[PDB]
Amino acid sequence: APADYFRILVQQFEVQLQQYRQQIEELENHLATQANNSHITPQDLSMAMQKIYQTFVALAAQLQSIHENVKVLKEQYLGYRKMFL
Amino acid sequence: APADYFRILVQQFEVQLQQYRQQIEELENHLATQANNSHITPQDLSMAMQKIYQTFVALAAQLQSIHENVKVLKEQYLGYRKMFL
Amino acid sequence: APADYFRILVQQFEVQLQQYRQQIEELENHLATQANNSHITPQDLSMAMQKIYQTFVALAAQLQSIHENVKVLKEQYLGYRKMFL
Amino acid sequence: APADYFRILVQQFEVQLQQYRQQIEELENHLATQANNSHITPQDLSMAMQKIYQTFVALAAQLQSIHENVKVLKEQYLGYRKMFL
Numbered sequence: 001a002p003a004d005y006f007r008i009l010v011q012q013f014e015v016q017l018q019q020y021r022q023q024i025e026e027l028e029n030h031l032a033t034q035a036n037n038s039h040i041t042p043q044d045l046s047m048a049m050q051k052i053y054q055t056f057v058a059l060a061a062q063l064q065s066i067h068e069n070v071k072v073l074k075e076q077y078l079g080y081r082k083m084f085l
Numbered sequence: 086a087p088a089d090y091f092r093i094l095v096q097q098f099e100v101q102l103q104q105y106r107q108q109i110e111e112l113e114n115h116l117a118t119q120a121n122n123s124h125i126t127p128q129d130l131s132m133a134m135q136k137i138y139q140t141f142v143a144l145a146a147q148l149q150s151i152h153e154n155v156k157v158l159k160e161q162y163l164g165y166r167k168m169f170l
Numbered sequence: 171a172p173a174d175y176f177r178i179l180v181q182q183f184e185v186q187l188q189q190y191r192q193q194i195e196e197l198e199n200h201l202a203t204q205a206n207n208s209h210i211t212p213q214d215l216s217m218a219m220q221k222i223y224q225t226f227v228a229l230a231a232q233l234q235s236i237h238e239n240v241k242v243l244k245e246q247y248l249g250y251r252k253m254f255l
Numbered sequence: 256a257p258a259d260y261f262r263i264l265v266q267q268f269e270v271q272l273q274q275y276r277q278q279i280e281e282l283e284n285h286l287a288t289q290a291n292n293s294h295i296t297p298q299d300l301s302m303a304m305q306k307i308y309q310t311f312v313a314l315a316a317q318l319q320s321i322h323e324n325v326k327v328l329k330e331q332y333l334g335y336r337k338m339f340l
Contacts, residue, residue, distance in 0.1 A: 003124075007207050010116075010125050013133070014206075017113055018199050022192075024106050029188050031099060032287050036181050036295070039088075040095045042155050048098070049148050056141055063134050070127050096291050103284050113202070114273050120206035121266050173294075180286075180295045183303070187283050191276060198272050205265060212261060212325045215268060219318050222272075226311055233304050240297050 009069050016062045023055050094154050105144045179236050186232045193225045271317045278310045
């Protein structure tokens with residue numbers, strides 16, 4: 001600590017960004033499937049866009065949590081700097 | 086004529102989702118290198134999160150445009166469907 | 171029927187290429203964490219390289235499998251064209 | 256230090272693996288493109304496979320170059336080991 005703490009926060013950011021990326025990839029491939037199995041439809045397009053917004057809301061929650069943690073770290077360092085002047 | 090338009094709307098959605106995934110892939114690959122040579126800093130994490138939000142706001146604009154186009158196609162679809170029924 | 175057979179061969183190719191990507195991407199994600207928070211013995215670099223080669227040999231077996239099927243399809247196409255001329 | 260050199264070797268591996276993934280992804284999107292346009296053809300499948308083999312041979316060359324460097328590093332450590340006995 002505290003570099004260990006931040007190292008965990010960074011590991012979390014990366015891993016979350018990967019999961020998200022692969023959720024998007026799953027969509028791209030789901031469409032690539034129903035592009036040569038049966039031309040894509042409006043219904044498909046709408047549920048897809050819907051899955052995009054949804055999965056991003058999830059990602060954003062994750063990023064917000066990470067943001068809170070780093071903000072705490074910043075406030076701690078701050079206090080130290082306020083004492084030292 | 087309709088199927089063609091929507092075919093182009095589908096092509097747009099896919100290629101937009103591709104570009105998006107590429108930008109995110111760049112971010113990740115940038116953190117995987119800027120963490121190997123030296124150590125990622127809270128500044129990097131912050132700017133990365135920021136670029137994610139910006140990148141999604143862009144993608145979202147693209148998606149809304151596509152959504153308007155399909156909505157129009159739906160308006161016409163109902164234009165006929167209402168007369169014949 | 172010929173178009174259908176080939177259609178299946180085509181989505182088999184794409185999907186095999188997808189899974190191949192996932193295997194790689196995964197290998198990279200394992201390095202973007204186990205090497206950015208800690209160090210990594212060269213023999214782990216060797217293990218990764220070895221997983222690359224093995225994963226490719228698998229992919230190549232898949233590709234040759236589908237290649238045989240298109241080759242047969244070509245032989246049939248050829249038989250028809252030859253009788254006709 | 257030998258850690259700096261090997262650190263560069265690791266950065267090379269990762270970056271070459273990302274590049275590789277990008278070439279495969281590009282080719283993988285190219286098929287998604289020429290699927291919604293017309294229909295993927297045996298010509299396409301053939302050239303695509305050829306692209307896979309060709310791109311992997313390049314990747315393997317890169318990996319071989321890396322392997323020789325780590326090999327040298329190992330022989331060096333070895334020379335030290337034989338002295339210490």
